[PDB]
Write an enzyme that holds these catalytic residues in place. Sequence first.
Site, short mmCIF file in Angstrom:
data_model
loop_
_atom_site.label_atom_id
_atom_site.label_comp_id
_atom_site.label_asym_id
_atom_site.label_seq_id
_atom_site.Cartn_x
_atom_site.Cartn_y
_atom_site.Cartn_z
CE1 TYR A 12 -2.82 -3.37 1.28
CE2 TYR A 12 -4.18 -1.75 0.15
CZ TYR A 12 -3.97 -3.05 0.59
OH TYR A 12 -4.89 -4.05 0.40
N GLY A 13 1.78 1.38 0.95
CA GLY A 13 2.57 2.61 0.98
C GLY A 13 3.37 2.80 -0.32
CD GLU A 32 7.12 -7.42 -3.92
OE1 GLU A 32 7.33 -8.44 -3.22
OE2 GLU A 32 6.74 -6.30 -3.47
N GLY A 112 -8.11 -9.87 3.44
CA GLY A 112 -9.56 -10.04 3.32
C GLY A 112 -10.30 -8.93 2.64
CB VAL A 242 16.36 -3.67 -1.19
CG1 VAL A 242 17.45 -2.76 -0.62
CG2 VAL A 242 15.80 -3.12 -2.51
CD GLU A 353 -12.30 -11.24 9.70
OE1 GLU A 353 -11.13 -10.84 9.88
OE2 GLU A 353 -12.54 -12.28 9.07
CG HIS A 439 -4.26 -6.27 11.08
ND1 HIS A 439 -5.40 -6.05 11.85
CD2 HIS A 439 -4.63 -6.99 9.97
CE1 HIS A 439 -6.37 -6.64 11.21
NE2 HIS A 439 -5.96 -7.21 10.09
CG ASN A 477 -9.96 -4.96 9.30
OD1 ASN A 477 -11.01 -4.60 9.80
ND2 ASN A 477 -9.56 -6.26 9.19
CG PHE A 479 -6.11 -2.21 3.18
CD1 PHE A 479 -6.86 -1.33 2.40
CD2 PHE A 479 -6.55 -3.52 3.24
CE1 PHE A 479 -8.00 -1.72 1.75
CE2 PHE A 479 -7.70 -3.94 2.60
CZ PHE A 479 -8.43 -3.07 1.85
C1 LIG Z 1 -4.17 -12.93 6.21
C2 LIG Z 1 -4.22 -11.41 6.21
C3 LIG Z 1 -5.43 -10.79 6.26
C4 LIG Z 1 -5.55 -9.39 6.27
N1 LIG Z 1 -6.80 -8.81 6.12
C5 LIG Z 1 -6.85 -7.41 6.07
C6 LIG Z 1 -8.05 -6.78 5.67
O1 LIG Z 1 -9.08 -7.38 5.27
N2 LIG Z 1 -8.02 -5.40 5.72
C7 LIG Z 1 -6.93 -4.65 6.17
O2 LIG Z 1 -7.08 -3.41 6.27
N3 LIG Z 1 -5.74 -5.26 6.35
C8 LIG Z 1 -5.71 -6.62 6.29
N4 LIG Z 1 -4.48 -7.19 6.41
C9 LIG Z 1 -3.32 -6.33 6.66
C10 LIG Z 1 -2.81 -5.62 5.40
O3 LIG Z 1 -2.72 -6.56 4.33
C11 LIG Z 1 -1.49 -4.96 5.73
O4 LIG Z 1 -1.72 -4.07 6.81
C12 LIG Z 1 -0.94 -4.16 4.53
O5 LIG Z 1 -0.78 -5.03 3.42
C13 LIG Z 1 0.38 -3.50 4.90
O6 LIG Z 1 0.80 -2.67 3.81
P1 LIG Z 1 2.31 -2.19 3.70
O7 LIG Z 1 2.38 -1.28 2.54
O8 LIG Z 1 2.82 -1.75 5.02
O9 LIG Z 1 3.12 -3.56 3.38
P2 LIG Z 1 2.84 -4.92 2.58
O10 LIG Z 1 1.48 -4.89 1.95
O11 LIG Z 1 3.17 -6.04 3.50
O12 LIG Z 1 3.87 -4.87 1.37
C14 LIG Z 1 5.29 -4.94 1.52
C15 LIG Z 1 5.84 -5.45 0.20
O13 LIG Z 1 7.27 -5.25 0.22
C16 LIG Z 1 7.92 -6.43 -0.25
N5 LIG Z 1 9.23 -6.48 0.35
C17 LIG Z 1 9.55 -6.62 1.66
N6 LIG Z 1 10.83 -6.50 1.92
C18 LIG Z 1 11.39 -6.24 0.68
C19 LIG Z 1 12.75 -6.03 0.28
N7 LIG Z 1 13.75 -6.00 1.17
N8 LIG Z 1 12.99 -5.85 -1.02
C20 LIG Z 1 11.95 -5.89 -1.88
N9 LIG Z 1 10.65 -6.09 -1.63
C21 LIG Z 1 10.45 -6.25 -0.28
C22 LIG Z 1 6.98 -7.56 0.14
O14 LIG Z 1 7.26 -8.78 -0.51
C23 LIG Z 1 5.60 -6.95 -0.09
O15 LIG Z 1 5.12 -7.20 -1.40
C24 LIG Z 1 -4.37 -8.60 6.30
C25 LIG Z 1 -3.16 -9.24 6.19
C26 LIG Z 1 -3.06 -10.65 6.15
C27 LIG Z 1 -1.69 -11.29 6.07
#
Ligand SMILES: Cc1cc2nc3c(=O)[nH]c(=O)nc-3n(C[C@H](O)[C@H](O)[C@H](O)COP(=O)(O)OP(=O)(O)OC[C@H]3O[C@@H](n4cnc5c(N)ncnc54)[C@H](O)[C@@H]3O)c2cc1C
Length: 498
Positions: A12-13, A32, A112, A242, A353, A439, A477, A479
């Site tokens: 997301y970020g 990625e 989800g 990375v 949930e 989360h 939740n 995201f």
């Molecule tokens: C089973 C499950 C259910 C969930 N259900 C919900 C829901 O319904 N609603 C909700 O709001 N949240 C939910 N979440 C939480 C939500 O998915 C996360 O809060 C959100 O994805 C976090 O976003 P982010 O941008 O911090 O990181 P992430 O989405 O975790 O993305 C990080 C990305 O960086 C990549 N990466 C990591 N390290 C490196 C590196 N060193 N070099 C290159 N790439 C790298 C990863 O592979 C990944 O693709 C759920 C999560 C899970 C696991």
Amino acid sequence: GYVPAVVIGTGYGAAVSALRLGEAGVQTLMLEMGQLWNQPGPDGNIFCGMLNPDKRSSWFKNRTEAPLGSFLWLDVVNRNIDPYAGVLDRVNYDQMSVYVGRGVGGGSLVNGGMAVEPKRSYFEEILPRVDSSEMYDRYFPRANSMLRVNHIDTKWFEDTEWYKFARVSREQAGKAGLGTVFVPNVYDFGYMQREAAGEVPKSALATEVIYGNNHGKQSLDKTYLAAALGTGKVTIQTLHQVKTIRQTKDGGYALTVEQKDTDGKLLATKEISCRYLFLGAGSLGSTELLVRARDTGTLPNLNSEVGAGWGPNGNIMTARANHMWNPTGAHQSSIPALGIDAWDNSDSSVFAEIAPMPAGLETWVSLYLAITKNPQRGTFVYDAATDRAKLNWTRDQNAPAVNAAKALFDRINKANGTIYRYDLFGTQLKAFADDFCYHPLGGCVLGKATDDYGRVAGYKNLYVTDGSLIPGSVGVNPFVTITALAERNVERIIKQDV
Ligand SMILES: Cc1cc2nc3c(=O)[nH]c(=O)nc-3n(C[C@H](O)[C@H](O)[C@H](O)COP(=O)(O)OP(=O)(O)OC[C@H]3O[C@@H](n4cnc5c(N)ncnc54)[C@H](O)[C@@H]3O)c2cc1C
Ligand SMILES: [Mn+2]
């Protein structure tokens, strides 16, 4: 090579950041570590379902695992697998297992879909240095639209067999005085109606979610990342992890980046440099990169708040055994639609949930993922021996979360004359799963490790964009909050710094 901006990760970020950078004309490379999920596999589908897990289910594990809560019914389908670049990573720390997505789209691939804005009064509590009016007036609406949030049709929900499980918990909660709320989602609910009618291929209604959805779910590859690619200024390189970050002698940042195949074989180690560096590797990944860089001397002016302030969003799982006259159904949509809102910002708060279960036969179980308010925090501590940032969290730190979840569900059990299940999480009697996290929040907290826009303290043109910014808890939740904060941050960083 050099590229003006690099974004690490594609969750997301990262996705928000790259879209806005591309629209500003900044040539941007996203790195990625997981795959672009677009190849039909051996069953003809991109993703495995929960009843047919295979190596696509798992990031470098040698056996599939049942979804939490469902071991008693889904262990029968578990199998040995080759370690592979699969989509869901259970990251094991000493007393906590954090589940994260791996692939183009990050956790949006496996989550989800539930798209929920935090309570404003709680946002103001957790992030008092942030102007909450701009968040609610501008950035939350922007995120809602870009994410493609939609709402279930109430009559369909009421009538369909696929949500009986939700209606049963609604009725039970109501006997205790407790209210539920509909949960907006990025899964297309119109599509879901058509799945139930037999009109389109099933995904939510075919026991898919946590290893990806082959249809219906508007993950980030379809929304922000598709738009970022559409700018003409963004590219994505996959299976690129990375490893290290340094400030180069002439300014900007240099990265060591490993390229692997889907078996994990190292193909190349590359040096990639940039002017602007944005971390979107998640709570775990961004924090690990920065604790490593500080403690190995490649970013020596990082502060002591790097690594601190982690919490699991108060995540606790529990389950109730229904009366025989309250079956939850053999057919349960894999996308939750209802929650119990008992969150008033007090220490007893619970947002829980009503979770489906995938067994596909009647079990009478109601499952819940509670979000609680627990002040305990952990720290990621670099281990130079293994080159890993270890989370020092101990299970007893979840006692306040368990206590809050238990007080709420005890009210429901008392009103209905029901008991917990004790056997869903392992053989030892345990009604509350207290050592997992979906989360993860924190490790590079906004305004402590960074300024109030995610600019990393001690450095110029170095930004953190993701769940690592959030102070351990959002009450819902997460995201949508991550997305809206990223919208705020990148708009300000582009205006002032780029
Ligand atoms: C089973 C499950 C259910 C969930 N259900 C919900 C829901 O319904 N609603 C909700 O709001 N949240 C939910 N979440 C939480 C939500 O998915 C996360 O809060 C959100 O994805 C976090 O976003 P982010 O941008 O911090 O990181 P992430 O989405 O975790 O993305 C990080 C990305 O960086 C990549 N990466 C990591 N390290 C490196 C590196 N060193 N070099 C290159 N790439 C790298 C990863 O592979 C990944 O693709 C759920 C999560 C899970 C696991
Ligand atoms: Mn809406």
